[PDB]
Ligand binder design. Structure first.
Ligand code: HEM
Ligand SMILES: [Ca+2]
Ligand SMILES: [Ca+2]
Length: 366
């Protein structure tokens, strides 16, 4: 039955009210209302937690969205595929004792939902609560890596939870606010698109441009040529150049996924709604939704989509595109004016000096 929360929010179940203070503490203590470094890592973690599950291997291989990353921080976060996930894990662990009525599985997914709401253009995702507070650590090998090919990627997602190629491409819209710290051992926070603090479709457009060089080394596993490789890192700046993942390039050109990939270019609402549907399905892996309760009302209303249309970054244009999709014409778009590449800002405020919250904790990396 209904209750109103202490903030005035009408909920279908007063148990949802516990998440209100959790949301406030996640913002005040870690996310700081920003679509920044900490938010991005927490969103990455929702995926690393959820995807470790296998229909063909059965329940013993992993329980999916179960908080296994937080409850066993000495196991999965140190598997090679999750190198660097320690940051988000360590940031979330303290919230387990601060909010003891909330399971680790609920914590991970609610944190992801709140983090998403900080990103302009992101959908207000569904949030179901009631994941059990106990599980065991998943086995290794369940998380896709950027060097994997499309067949492998699609098989893993289908084996994890019956995801279609469309849902896989939809989930990868998340790379619109994604950067890499471990892919290149010489680079920190190399962004996958020119707007890593904006949930827009630039990622879909920019992976389709011809690659011209690298932001760092030229032979990292899982990385391919980038269309906008230059930054100011060679002179001590923090604006790293753009990085392209092999897996994103492969999804953009494979016959099973290429039309879905291009279909999101300049389609803000279609992209954000598609990501939301596939993400809601990701968030309840390992669970029957019948055993969960709907607490979507306590997910914050997200920052609205930006005014800016989808455009070619400075120095690029349609003549630079490598197209693979015959079913739909690539749209006519404007080109950002400028004779040289525009540095991609290290921080959502346009500067380079922002800092992020990092709690110390048991999870580690290399
Ligand atoms: C084929 C599947 C995927 C591959 C191969 C992949 C790969 C990667 C890699 C290599 C990084 C860089 C990590 C680093 O070096 O620091 C990354 C970051 C990230 N991933 Fe993906 N990922 C996949 C799917 C997903 C999904 C399904 C989501 C969420 C729904 C997601 C969300 C993110 C986010 C938000 C970041 C940025 C973290 C940050 O900037 O702090 N990824 N991913
Ligand atoms: Ca898990
Ligand atoms: Ca973006």
């Amino acid at each position: 039955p209904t209750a109103v929360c202490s903030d005035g929010t009408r909920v279908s179940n007063a148990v949802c009210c516990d998440f209100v203070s959790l949301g406030q503490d996640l913002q005040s203590m870690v996310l700081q209302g920003d679509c920044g470094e900490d938010a991005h890592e927490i969103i990455r973690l929702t995926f690393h937690d959820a995807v470790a599950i296998s229909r063909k291997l059965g329940p013993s291989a992993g329980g999916g969205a179960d908080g296994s990353m937080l409850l066993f921080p000495l196991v999965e976060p140190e598997f090679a595929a999750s190198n660097g996930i320690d940051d988000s894990v360590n940031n979330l662990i303290p919230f387990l004792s601060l909010h003891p009525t909330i399971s680790a599985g609920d914590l991970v997914q609610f944190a992801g939902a709140v983090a998403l709401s900080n990103c302009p253009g992101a959908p207000r995702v569904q949030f179901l609560a009631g994941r059990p507070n106990h599980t065991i650590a998943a086995i290794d090998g369940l998380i896709p890596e950027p060097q994997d090919n499309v067949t492998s990627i699609l098989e893993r997602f289908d084996d994890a939870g019956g995801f279609t190629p469309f849902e896989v491409v939809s989930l990868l819209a998340s790379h619109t606010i994604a950067r890499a710290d471990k892919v290149d051992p010489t680079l920190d926070a190399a962004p996958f698109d020119t707007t890593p603090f904006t949930f827009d479709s630039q990622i879909f457009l920019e992976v389709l441009l011809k690659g011209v060089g690298f932001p760092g080394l030229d032979n990292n596993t899982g990385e391919v040529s980038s269309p906008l490789p230059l930054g100011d890192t060679s002179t001590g700046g923090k604006d790293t150049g753009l990085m392209r993942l092999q897996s994103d390039f492969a999804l953009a050109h494979d016959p099973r996924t290429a039309c879905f990939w291009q279909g999101f270019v300049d389609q803000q609402e279609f992209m954000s709604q598609s990501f939301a549907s596939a993400f809601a399905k990701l968030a309840v892996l390992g669970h029957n939704t019948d055993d969960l309760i709907d607490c979507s009302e306590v997910v914050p209303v997200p920052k609205p989509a930006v005014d800016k249309p989808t455009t070619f970054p400075a120095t690029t244009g349609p003549q630079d595109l490598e197209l693979s999709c015959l079913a739909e014409r690539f749209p006519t778009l404007s080109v950002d004016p400028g004779a040289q590449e525009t540095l991609i800002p290290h921080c959502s405020d346009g500067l380079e000096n922002c800092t992020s919250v990092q709690f110390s904790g048991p999870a580690t990396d290399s």
